[PDB]
Amino acid sequence: IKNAFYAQSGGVTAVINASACGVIQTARKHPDQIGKVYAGRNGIIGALKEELIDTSLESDDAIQALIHTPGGAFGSCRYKREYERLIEVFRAHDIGYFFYNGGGDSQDTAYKVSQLADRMGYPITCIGVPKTVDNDLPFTDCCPGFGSVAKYIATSTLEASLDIKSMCETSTKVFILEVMGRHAGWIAAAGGLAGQSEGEPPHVILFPEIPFNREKFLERVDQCVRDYGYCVVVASEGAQYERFGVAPALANMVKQALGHKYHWAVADYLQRAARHIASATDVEQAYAVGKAAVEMALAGKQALMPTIVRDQAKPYRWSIGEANLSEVANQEKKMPIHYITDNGFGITQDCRDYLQPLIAGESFPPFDDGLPRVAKLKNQLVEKKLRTEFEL
Amino acid sequence: IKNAFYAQSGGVTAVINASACGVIQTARKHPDQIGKVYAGRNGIIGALKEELIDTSLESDDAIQALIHTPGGAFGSCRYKREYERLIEVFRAHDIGYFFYNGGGDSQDTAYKVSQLADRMGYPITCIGVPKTVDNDLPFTDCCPGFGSVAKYIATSTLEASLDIKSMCETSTKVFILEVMGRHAGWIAAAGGLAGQSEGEPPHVILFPEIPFNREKFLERVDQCVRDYGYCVVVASEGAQYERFGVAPALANMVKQALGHKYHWAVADYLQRAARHIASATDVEQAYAVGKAAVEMALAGKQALMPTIVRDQAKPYRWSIGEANLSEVANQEKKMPIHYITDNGFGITQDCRDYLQPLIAGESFPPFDDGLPRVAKLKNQLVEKKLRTEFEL
Ligand code: NA
Ligand code: NA
């Protein structure tokens, strides 16, 4: 029970590989407690199909590269007997450590593995590493990955705004930028960090937490174009009533109803892969939770998820705390309404106090020939052992 | 005839303000030849309506900020008697220098002003400063602004690709990224800089120069998803036959015809406003053409547009040259087909040799509280003089 198994889960992030780096590098700093670090090819599917990547065959440099490369270096999946097969392949490979890096579902399943492992007489210390661009995990200040998209959305909103503002007298006067966020508006909220007073961008932020009042929307925008000269709205894909992609939908609304020239963009995967403008504090934290999960497992702790704790709002200070996987599931983290302005289309000062520090600092990745440098892993498989196995 | 008039024209750029900086700073370095530098509020419309911005009231710092702030700091317009009114307001304000910073149309009109100025007995040296995200101006290696979008598109394609690649076995296997470029494919071509061999992203680049062969497209993508696991296409809004926004259109094509899970994004204004990942050589050149236009005017030269000349492909070397405005119009610059692969969906080595150096180096702007710092100008108007004036 000396090797460790690391796997990613759910949608990838611009810094989820930073976590992988934090976990892998510290594991290598304890050869007397942990042997090889195996990575699940394409997530737990990898463990299930017994496709284990031997990350020990990877040079220190490559591993170091992980902190400035987006996506999932080993691959991920959204996949949610199976538990029995996980322990069968873990013990066959001397795996006593299970580091599961993902959203809520992941944390829960990590816990269950822990339960079955004991039951079957095969303890395996399982520590989950937080990961969510939606920032909806509980018992943590922020979720690794969000800080970076927040910075991206805020920057993108600020830049597009300066553009529109430049020619709103002649050309387009309404710009809509559709961002991620189906049930949570944390991402859309980051857009408000672009402007700090009233009259400056973004004029409208569509939160999925606030039902869409077409009449209130159409009149706020119209009011903006003829007061400030233009209007930029940051709408999350989760715009709903009690849906609507969204960008073009609203654009059509303003056109047929206000006649203003519009423009829209849809960042999609761009926002969660923009490692070029990642948040330093975010990649810093992505690394830390990975290191702390390997440390908690060394200290002999069990079934925990590392956390980020805000030890100080003023001059923002943070550190890593702990949380019981057992309770991570069936809790979540909803965006507190007192974060949204009464207009329903704005962020409040309490929300700025929370976000602003999260996007602090820049962690530009190194650049080679004009482009960002990326990992480049061997990702070689270990020699099978079991006798095959199908999934659902 | 000692003050100068600067104006922007057409769509703004991430570095068009860098040009404005290059022109303004050098003008201030010759108080014995040039007086105050006036800026046209919202382009020549400003001169027409006699709304002149006194940029002399701006601090050196603010002016310096111009090189790291996107959009048009003084505003721009797409506007194309009027010539007579331009000279009437120029001479009323002692303007002997006219620095017009825009695309082809701008250059031509700059020239005509020069012609009328003489005819009317009011010489005004007019030097045009190149500006085009479409990179279709003639007599110049590259057009200021393009290098930056190119870098943005290439980076964005590389980042989104790493994402898709991470989960193409379980989730989405076809990603489409719609970029700017209606009649030219220079922007779309920049996407190819993300991958250098065959099999790596972008697998398909839709150029407006190549007619869209649906069957050839659908089979190239399908061939890619089941050969490399996924397929990313960078399509310019100018995808046509002999149109189709485009992103969702093609997405629908692959869905109904290949059944693959897709994803798309539409960068829109984001690509031309992304000063955060601008190209150093690009902002370097944007400044230089601005400085060189003020220099050519000091040397007493007339009716010229500064240019960028590639004095060396190998270890890329460039400098500023000159071009007769008189001929800039009614020429243009088409993308040479031997730059596009025979597949019709790729960039060729000759195209890489041309582009790669253009996106070289990073010019990250300074950052304040998590976001990029921006100009902040007074942009005060000079006291009217004429007796009003309407436009068309
Ligand atoms: Na997820
Ligand atoms: Na133009």
From TrEMBL, chains A, B:
**Which InterPro entries does the UniProt record give?**
ATP_PFK, PFKA, Phosphofructokinase_dom, PKF_sf, PPi-PFK
Can you quote a single GO CC term? cytoplasm
Mechanisms controlling activity: Non-allosteric.
Cofactors that this protein relies on: Mg(2+)
SUPFAM superfamilies (UniProt xref): Phosphofructokinase
Q: Which Gene3D superfamilies match?
A: 3.40.50.450, Phosphofructokinase domain
Subcellular location per the Swiss-Prot or TrEMBL entry:
Cytoplasm
| One Pfam family in the UniProt entry | PFK
Q: Where is this site: Important for catalytic activity?
A: 131
Instruction: Quote the EC number.
Output: 2.7.1.90
Q: What is its main location?
A: cytoplasm
**Active-site residues, Swiss-Prot/TrEMBL:** 134 (proton acceptor)
User: What are this entry's molecular-function GO terms?
Assistant: 6-phosphofructokinase activity; diphosphate-fructose-6-phosphate 1-phosphotransferase activity; metal ion binding
Q: Describe the protein's quaternary organization and the partners it interacts with.
A: Homodimer.
Q: What does this protein do?
A: Catalyzes the phosphorylation of D-fructose 6-phosphate, the first committing step of glycolysis. Uses inorganic phosphate (PPi) as phosphoryl donor instead of ATP like common ATP-dependent phosphofructokinases (ATP-PFKs), which renders the reaction reversible, and can thus function both in glycolysis and gluconeogenesis. Consistently, PPi-PFK can replace the enzymes of both the forward (ATP-PFK) and reverse (fructose-bisphosphatase (FBPase)) reactions.
Indicate the family of this protein: Belongs to the phosphofructokinase type A (PFKA) family. PPi-dependent PFK group II subfamily. Clade 'B2' sub-subfamily.
Q: What is this protein called?
A: Pyrophosphate--fructose 6-phosphate 1-phosphotransferase
Supply the source organism for this entry.
Marinobacter nauticus (strain ATCC 700491 / DSM 11845 / VT8)
- In the UniProt record, the gene name given for this protein reads pfp
